[PDB]
Protein backbone atom coordinates (compact mmCIF):
# COMPACT_ATOMS: atom_id res chain seq x y z
CA UNK A 1 0.00 0.00 0.00
CA UNK A 2 0.84 3.79 0.20
CA UNK A 3 4.27 4.95 1.58
CA UNK A 4 4.12 6.74 4.97
CA UNK A 5 5.96 10.02 4.27
CA UNK A 6 5.28 11.42 7.80
CA UNK A 7 8.16 13.37 9.41
CA UNK A 8 9.62 12.15 12.70
CA UNK A 9 10.90 15.33 14.37
CA UNK A 10 13.85 14.90 16.78
CA UNK A 11 13.82 17.65 19.45
CA UNK A 12 16.82 18.77 21.56
CA UNK A 13 16.43 18.47 25.40
CA UNK A 14 17.54 22.18 25.63
CA UNK A 15 14.64 23.31 23.27
CA UNK A 16 11.98 22.54 25.93
CA UNK A 17 11.37 22.84 29.72
CA UNK A 18 9.38 20.62 32.19
CA UNK A 19 7.15 22.76 34.43
CA UNK A 20 5.16 20.26 36.60
CA UNK A 21 3.73 16.69 36.67
CA UNK A 22 0.23 16.34 35.13
CA UNK A 23 -0.27 12.65 35.90
CA UNK A 24 1.35 9.28 36.66
CA UNK A 25 -0.03 5.81 35.86
CA UNK A 26 0.31 2.61 33.76
CA UNK A 27 1.52 4.70 30.74
CA UNK A 28 4.34 6.36 32.74
CA UNK A 29 4.53 10.03 33.74
CA UNK A 30 3.18 13.06 31.78
CA UNK A 31 4.62 16.56 32.40
CA UNK A 32 3.30 20.05 31.66
CA UNK A 33 5.95 21.79 29.54
CA UNK A 34 7.01 24.56 27.18
CA UNK A 35 8.79 24.22 23.83
CA UNK A 36 10.85 27.20 22.49
CA UNK A 37 12.15 26.02 19.03
CA UNK A 38 15.52 27.30 17.62
CA UNK A 39 15.27 31.08 16.97
CA UNK A 40 11.55 31.06 16.10
CA UNK A 41 10.43 33.50 18.89
CA UNK A 42 7.53 31.11 19.92
CA UNK A 43 6.53 29.22 23.13
CA UNK A 44 4.44 26.07 22.53
CA UNK A 45 2.52 24.59 25.54
CA UNK A 46 3.45 20.89 25.47
CA UNK A 47 2.80 17.59 27.28
CA UNK A 48 5.93 15.43 27.77
CA UNK A 49 5.32 11.65 28.18
CA UNK A 50 8.30 9.60 29.54
CA UNK A 51 8.70 5.86 30.47
CA UNK A 52 14.13 2.22 34.19
CA UNK A 53 15.58 2.18 30.63
CA UNK A 54 14.84 -1.20 29.02
CA UNK A 55 15.05 -2.13 25.26
CA UNK A 56 11.42 -3.48 25.27
CA UNK A 57 9.88 -0.28 26.80
CA UNK A 58 11.78 1.90 24.25
CA UNK A 59 10.40 -0.26 21.38
CA UNK A 60 6.80 0.15 22.68
CA UNK A 61 7.10 3.95 23.04
CA UNK A 62 8.70 4.21 19.53
CA UNK A 63 5.84 2.04 18.18
CA UNK A 64 3.40 4.62 19.62
CA UNK A 65 5.58 7.52 18.29
CA UNK A 66 5.33 6.01 14.75
CA UNK A 67 1.47 5.91 14.83
CA UNK A 68 1.14 9.35 16.57
CA UNK A 69 3.45 11.07 14.00
CA UNK A 70 1.41 9.47 11.14
CA UNK A 71 -1.89 11.22 12.05
CA UNK A 72 -3.14 14.73 11.13
CA UNK A 73 -6.77 15.58 11.98
CA UNK A 74 -8.39 18.29 14.20
CA UNK A 75 -9.93 15.56 16.43
CA UNK A 76 -6.82 13.31 16.79
CA UNK A 77 -3.70 13.89 18.97
CA UNK A 78 -0.57 14.25 16.79
CA UNK A 79 3.05 13.70 17.95
CA UNK A 80 4.98 17.02 17.80
CA UNK A 81 8.31 15.21 18.16
CA UNK A 82 10.56 12.91 20.22
CA UNK A 83 13.58 13.64 22.41
CA UNK A 84 16.36 11.02 22.26
CA UNK A 85 17.51 11.03 25.89
CA UNK A 86 18.54 7.91 27.88
CA UNK A 87 14.85 7.84 29.02
CA UNK A 88 13.37 8.77 25.50
CA UNK A 89 10.24 10.99 25.69
CA UNK A 90 7.23 11.87 23.48
CA UNK A 91 6.44 15.57 23.00
CA UNK A 92 2.71 16.08 22.46
CA UNK A 93 0.22 18.98 22.49
CA UNK A 94 -0.94 20.31 25.91
CA UNK A 95 -4.68 19.53 26.36
CA UNK A 96 -5.10 21.81 29.43
CA UNK A 97 -8.45 20.39 30.62
CA UNK A 98 -7.15 16.76 30.77
CA UNK A 99 -9.26 13.70 29.89
CA UNK A 100 -12.98 13.89 29.05
CA UNK A 101 -13.77 11.20 31.67
CA UNK A 102 -12.44 13.32 34.58
CA UNK A 103 -13.92 16.45 32.91
CA UNK A 104 -17.55 15.11 32.83
CA UNK A 105 -17.17 13.88 36.45
CA UNK A 106 -15.80 17.26 37.71
CA UNK A 107 -18.12 19.53 35.65
CA UNK A 108 -21.50 17.60 35.37
CA UNK A 109 -23.40 20.66 36.81
CA UNK A 110 -22.25 22.90 33.88
CA UNK A 111 -22.33 20.30 31.07
CA UNK A 112 -25.33 20.70 28.76
CA UNK A 113 -26.82 18.75 25.81
CA UNK A 114 -25.02 20.89 23.15
CA UNK A 115 -21.61 19.99 24.64
CA UNK A 116 -22.29 16.22 24.98
CA UNK A 117 -23.68 15.91 21.43
CA UNK A 118 -20.83 18.05 19.97
CA UNK A 119 -18.25 15.78 21.73
CA UNK A 120 -19.98 12.74 20.16
CA UNK A 121 -19.71 14.41 16.68
CA UNK A 122 -16.00 15.21 17.31
CA UNK A 123 -15.11 11.67 18.51
CA UNK A 124 -16.96 10.19 15.48
CA UNK A 125 -14.94 12.55 13.15
CA UNK A 126 -11.57 11.56 14.65
CA UNK A 127 -12.59 7.90 14.52
CA UNK A 128 -13.77 8.21 10.88
CA UNK A 129 -10.34 9.79 10.12
CA UNK A 130 -8.52 6.84 11.78
CA UNK A 131 -10.66 4.53 9.56
CA UNK A 132 -9.68 6.55 6.41
CA UNK A 133 -6.02 6.11 7.45
CA UNK A 134 -6.84 2.33 7.92
CA UNK A 135 -5.95 2.54 11.65
CA UNK A 136 -7.81 0.42 14.26
CA UNK A 137 -7.61 2.21 17.67
CA UNK A 138 -8.23 -0.89 19.95
CA UNK A 139 -8.44 1.35 23.11
CA UNK A 140 -11.19 3.96 22.58
CA UNK A 141 -12.62 5.17 25.94
CA UNK A 142 -13.57 8.54 27.55
CA UNK A 143 -10.14 8.34 29.35
CA UNK A 144 -8.45 8.42 25.88
CA UNK A 145 -10.34 11.53 24.67
CA UNK A 146 -8.56 14.73 25.78
CA UNK A 147 -9.96 18.25 26.15
CA UNK A 148 -8.05 21.13 24.40
CA UNK A 149 -10.93 23.56 25.27
CA UNK A 150 -14.41 22.52 26.64
CA UNK A 151 -15.65 22.93 23.00
CA UNK A 152 -12.76 20.99 21.36
CA UNK A 153 -11.85 17.35 22.17
CA UNK A 154 -9.33 14.94 20.49
CA UNK A 155 -8.71 11.15 20.49
CA UNK A 156 -5.37 9.92 21.96
CA UNK A 157 -3.42 6.77 23.15
CA UNK A 158 -2.02 4.89 20.13
CA UNK A 159 -0.23 2.28 22.30
CA UNK A 160 -2.69 -0.36 20.98
CA UNK A 161 -3.38 1.20 17.49
CA UNK A 162 -2.65 -1.43 14.77
CA UNK A 163 -6.89 -5.40 27.89
CA UNK A 164 -9.98 -3.10 28.32
CA UNK A 165 -12.73 -5.82 28.39
CA UNK A 166 -15.60 -3.45 29.41
CA UNK A 167 -14.98 -1.33 26.23
CA UNK A 168 -14.38 -4.29 23.87
CA UNK A 169 -16.64 -5.83 21.22
CA UNK A 170 -17.71 -9.48 21.85
CA UNK A 171 -15.51 -10.77 18.90
CA UNK A 172 -12.49 -9.02 20.49
CA UNK A 173 -13.01 -10.68 23.94
CA UNK A 174 -13.74 -14.16 22.51
CA UNK A 175 -11.58 -14.30 19.34
CA UNK A 176 -9.19 -11.27 19.60
CA UNK A 177 -10.74 -9.86 16.34
CA UNK A 178 -10.32 -6.06 16.02
CA UNK A 179 -11.90 -4.08 13.18
CA UNK A 180 -13.16 -0.48 12.69
CA UNK A 181 -16.57 -1.96 13.62
CA UNK A 182 -15.07 -3.17 16.93
CA UNK A 183 -13.95 0.50 17.48
CA UNK A 184 -17.68 1.40 16.97
CA UNK A 185 -18.52 -0.83 20.02
CA UNK A 186 -15.91 1.12 22.09
CA UNK A 187 -17.49 4.33 20.69
CA UNK A 188 -20.93 3.31 22.07
CA UNK A 189 -19.36 2.65 25.53
CA UNK A 190 -17.51 6.05 25.36
CA UNK A 191 -20.88 7.77 24.58
CA UNK A 192 -22.43 5.90 27.56
CA UNK A 193 -19.57 7.18 29.80
CA UNK A 194 -20.34 10.78 28.72
CA UNK A 195 -24.16 10.48 29.00
CA UNK A 196 -23.80 9.13 32.59
CA UNK A 197 -21.29 11.94 33.48
CA UNK A 198 -18.41 9.47 33.91
CA UNK A 199 -20.00 6.31 35.34
CA UNK A 200 -17.91 3.09 35.47
CA UNK A 201 -19.40 0.59 32.90
CA UNK A 202 -20.69 -2.64 34.55
CA UNK A 203 -19.58 -1.31 37.99
CA UNK A 204 -18.92 -4.07 40.55
CA UNK A 205 -19.18 -6.80 37.86
CA UNK A 206 -15.84 -8.71 37.41
CA UNK A 207 -14.25 -8.56 33.89
CA UNK A 208 -14.49 -12.41 33.61
CA UNK A 209 -18.35 -12.18 33.76
CA UNK A 210 -18.62 -9.61 30.84
CA UNK A 211 -18.22 -12.19 27.98
CA UNK A 212 -21.19 -14.29 29.34
CA UNK A 213 -23.30 -11.16 30.15
CA UNK A 214 -23.03 -9.84 26.52
CA UNK A 215 -23.66 -13.34 25.02
CA UNK A 216 -27.01 -13.53 26.96
CA UNK A 217 -28.11 -10.17 25.50
CA UNK A 218 -27.38 -7.82 28.46
CA UNK A 219 -26.12 -4.30 27.59
CA UNK A 220 -25.32 -1.01 29.42
CA UNK A 221 -28.51 0.68 30.78
CA UNK A 222 -30.29 3.73 29.31
CA UNK A 223 -28.76 6.86 31.00
CA UNK A 224 -31.49 9.10 32.61
CA UNK A 225 -30.68 12.08 30.31
CA UNK A 226 -30.98 9.84 27.18
CA UNK A 227 -34.00 9.82 24.93
CA UNK A 228 -34.74 6.53 23.08
CA UNK A 229 -33.19 8.31 19.97
CA UNK A 230 -29.67 8.56 21.56
CA UNK A 231 -29.88 5.15 23.39
CA UNK A 232 -30.94 3.41 20.11
CA UNK A 233 -27.63 4.67 18.59
CA UNK A 234 -25.67 3.31 21.63
CA UNK A 235 -27.49 -0.06 21.36
CA UNK A 236 -26.78 -0.24 17.55
CA UNK A 237 -23.00 0.04 18.37
CA UNK A 238 -23.40 -3.08 20.59
CA UNK A 239 -24.93 -5.56 18.10
CA UNK A 240 -23.45 -9.11 17.79
CA UNK A 241 -23.09 -8.63 13.98
CA UNK A 242 -20.29 -6.04 13.43
CA UNK A 243 -21.67 -5.11 9.95
CA UNK A 244 -25.05 -4.28 11.57
CA UNK A 245 -23.32 -1.65 13.79
CA UNK A 246 -23.31 1.97 12.46
CA UNK A 247 -20.33 3.32 10.49
CA UNK A 248 -18.44 6.31 11.99
CA UNK A 249 -19.52 8.47 9.00
CA UNK A 250 -23.21 7.71 9.91
CA UNK A 251 -22.47 8.53 13.60
CA UNK A 252 -21.15 12.00 12.56
CA UNK A 253 -24.43 12.51 10.59
CA UNK A 254 -26.70 11.16 13.40
CA UNK A 255 -25.15 13.18 16.24
CA UNK A 256 -24.88 16.35 14.03
CA UNK A 257 -28.64 16.28 13.27
CA UNK A 258 -29.20 15.97 17.04
CA UNK A 259 -26.66 18.70 17.89
CA UNK A 260 -28.89 21.14 15.84
CA UNK A 261 -31.70 20.69 18.44
CA UNK A 262 -29.97 19.24 21.56
CA UNK A 263 -32.92 19.56 24.05
CA UNK A 264 -35.02 17.20 21.84
CA UNK A 265 -32.40 14.43 22.33
CA UNK A 266 -30.99 14.98 25.87
CA UNK A 267 -33.02 15.96 28.94
CA UNK A 268 -30.79 17.78 31.49
CA UNK A 269 -32.30 19.99 34.26
CA UNK A 270 -30.73 23.45 34.10
CA UNK A 271 -29.67 23.12 30.40
CA UNK A 272 -28.72 26.28 28.33
CA UNK A 273 -28.23 28.28 31.62
CA UNK A 274 -25.07 26.13 32.12
CA UNK A 275 -21.72 27.51 30.86
CA UNK A 276 -18.12 26.19 30.65
CA UNK A 277 -14.81 28.18 30.03
CA UNK A 278 -14.23 29.60 26.49
CA UNK A 279 -11.43 31.60 24.68
CA UNK A 280 -13.98 34.50 25.18
CA UNK A 281 -13.45 34.23 29.04
CA UNK A 282 -11.30 36.46 31.28
CA UNK A 283 -7.84 34.87 31.87
CA UNK A 284 -8.82 31.63 29.98
CA UNK A 285 -5.25 31.34 28.55
CA UNK A 286 2.33 31.51 34.47
CA UNK A 287 5.70 32.95 33.25
CA UNK A 288 5.69 35.02 29.99
CA UNK A 289 2.42 34.72 28.04
CA UNK A 290 3.96 36.99 25.33
CA UNK A 291 5.00 34.66 22.45
CA UNK A 292 2.88 31.57 23.26
CA UNK A 293 1.15 29.84 20.28
CA UNK A 294 -0.85 26.62 20.41
CA UNK A 295 0.65 23.58 18.58
CA UNK A 296 -2.35 23.61 16.16
CA UNK A 297 -1.07 27.01 14.86
CA UNK A 298 2.65 26.06 14.93
CA UNK A 299 3.33 24.39 11.55
CA UNK A 300 6.87 24.08 10.08
C1 LIG B 1 -4.21 15.76 33.52
C2 LIG B 1 -3.67 15.93 32.12
N1 LIG B 1 -3.45 17.10 31.59
C3 LIG B 1 -2.97 16.95 30.33
C4 LIG B 1 -2.56 17.85 29.34
N2 LIG B 1 -2.13 17.41 28.17
C5 LIG B 1 -2.03 16.11 27.87
N3 LIG B 1 -1.52 15.83 26.59
C6 LIG B 1 -1.54 14.63 25.89
C7 LIG B 1 -1.57 14.65 24.48
C8 LIG B 1 -1.58 13.43 23.81
N4 LIG B 1 -1.54 12.30 24.52
C9 LIG B 1 -1.52 12.31 25.85
N5 LIG B 1 -1.44 11.13 26.57
C10 LIG B 1 -2.61 10.55 27.24
C11 LIG B 1 -2.28 9.23 27.97
C12 LIG B 1 -1.32 8.37 27.14
C13 LIG B 1 -1.62 9.59 29.30
C14 LIG B 1 -3.57 8.47 28.27
N6 LIG B 1 -3.61 7.12 28.21
O1 LIG B 1 -4.58 9.06 28.60
N7 LIG B 1 -1.49 13.45 26.52
C15 LIG B 1 -2.39 15.14 28.82
C16 LIG B 1 -2.88 15.55 30.07
N8 LIG B 1 -3.35 14.93 31.23
C17 LIG B 1 -3.45 13.48 31.52
C18 LIG B 1 -4.30 12.71 30.51
C19 LIG B 1 -2.07 12.84 31.73
Curated annotation (Swiss-Prot):
Result, substituting residue 261 to A: Strongly reduced phosphorylation
Where do the Protein kinase domain residues begin and end? 16-266
- Locate the active site: 139
Outline the subunit composition: Binding of the ligand triggers homo- and/or heterodimerization of the receptor triggering its autophosphorylation. Heterodimer with ERBB2. Forms a complex with CCDC88A/GIV (via SH2-like regions) and GNAI3 which leads to enhanced EGFR signaling and triggering of cell migration; binding to CCDC88A requires autophosphorylation of the EGFR C-terminal region, and ligand stimulation is required for recruitment of GNAI3 to the complex. Interacts with ERRFI1; inhibits dimerization of the kinase domain and autophosphorylation. Part of a complex with ERBB2 and either PIK3C2A or PIK3C2B.
Membership in a protein family: Belongs to the protein kinase superfamily. Tyr protein kinase family. EGF receptor subfamily.
Q: What is the effect of changing residue 49 to A/M?
A: Abolishes kinase activity
Phosphoserine is found on 278, 282
| Record-listed N6-(2-hydroxyisobutyryl)lysine modification sites | 49
> What does it do?
Receptor tyrosine kinase binding ligands of the EGF family and activating several signaling cascades to convert extracellular cues into appropriate cellular responses. Known ligands include EGF, TGFA/TGF-alpha, AREG, epigen/EPGN, BTC/betacellulin, epiregulin/EREG and HBEGF/heparin-binding EGF. Ligand binding triggers receptor homo- and/or heterodimerization and autophosphorylation on key cytoplasmic residues. The phosphorylated receptor recruits adapter proteins like GRB2 which in turn activates complex downstream signaling cascades. Isoform 2 may act as an antagonist of EGF action.
Record organism: Homo sapiens (Human)
List the subcellular locations: Cell membrane; Endoplasmic reticulum membrane; Golgi apparatus membrane; Nucleus membrane
- The protein's name is Epidermal growth factor receptor
Q: Which residues of the parent protein does this chain contain?
A: 697 to 1018 of 1210
Instruction: Cite the effect that the entry attributes to residue 136 to L.
Output: Found in a lung cancer sample
Result, substituting residue 13 to K = Found in a lung cancer sample
Q: In which tissues is it expressed?
A: Ubiquitously expressed. Isoform 2 is also expressed in ovarian cancers.
Outcome of swapping residue 3 to A: Reduced phosphorylation
Known disease link: Lung cancer: A common malignancy affecting tissues of the lung. The most common form of lung cancer is non-small cell lung cancer (NSCLC) that can be divided into 3 major histologic subtypes: squamous cell carcinoma, adenocarcinoma, and large cell lung cancer. NSCLC is often diagnosed at an advanced stage and has a poor prognosis. Neonatal nephrocutaneous inflammatory syndrome: An autosomal recessive disorder characterized by intrauterine growth retardation, premature birth, fragile skin, recurrent skin infections and sepsis, failure to thrive, nephrocalcinosis, and nephromegaly with tubular dysfunction. Some patients have chronic diarrhea, and necrotizing enterocolitis.
Chain sites annotated for binding ATP? 22-30, 49, 92-93, 157
How does the record describe the protein's post-translational processing?
Phosphorylated on Tyr residues in response to EGF. Dephosphorylation by PTPRJ prevents endocytosis and stabilizes the receptor at the plasma membrane. Dephosphorylated by PTPN1 and PTPN2. Monoubiquitinated and polyubiquitinated upon EGF stimulation; which does not affect tyrosine kinase activity or signaling capacity but may play a role in lysosomal targeting. Polyubiquitin linkage is mainly through 'Lys-63', but linkage through 'Lys-48', 'Lys-11' and 'Lys-29' also occurs. Deubiquitination by OTUD7B prevents degradation. Ubiquitinated by RNF115 and RNF126. Ubiquitinated by ZNRF1 or CBL at different lysines in response to EGF stimulation; leading to recruitment of the ESCRT machinery and subsequent degradation in the lysosomes.
- Which residues in this protein are found as Phosphotyrosine? 285, 298
Q: Changing residue 4 to A: what effect?
A: Abolishes phosphorylation
Consequence recorded when altering residue 13 to G = Found in a lung cancer sample; constitutively activated kinase with higher levels of basal autophosphorylation; more sensitive to gefitinib than wild-type
Q: Which residues form a coiled coil?
A: none
Q: Cross-link of type Glycyl lysine isopeptide (Lys-Gly) (interchain with G-Cter in ubiquitin): positions?
A: 20, 41, 56, 59, 216, 247, 257
Q: What is the effect of changing residue 10 to A?
A: Abolishes phosphorylation
Amino acid sequence: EAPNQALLRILKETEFKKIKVLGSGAFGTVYKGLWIPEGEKVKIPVAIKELATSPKANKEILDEAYVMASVDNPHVCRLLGICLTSTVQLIMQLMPFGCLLDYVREHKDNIGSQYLLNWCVQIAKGMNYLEDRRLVHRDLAARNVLVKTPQHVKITDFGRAKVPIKWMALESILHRIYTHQSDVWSYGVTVWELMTFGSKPYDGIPASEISSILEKGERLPQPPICTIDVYMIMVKCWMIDADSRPKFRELIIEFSKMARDPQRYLVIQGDERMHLPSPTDSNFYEEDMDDVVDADEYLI
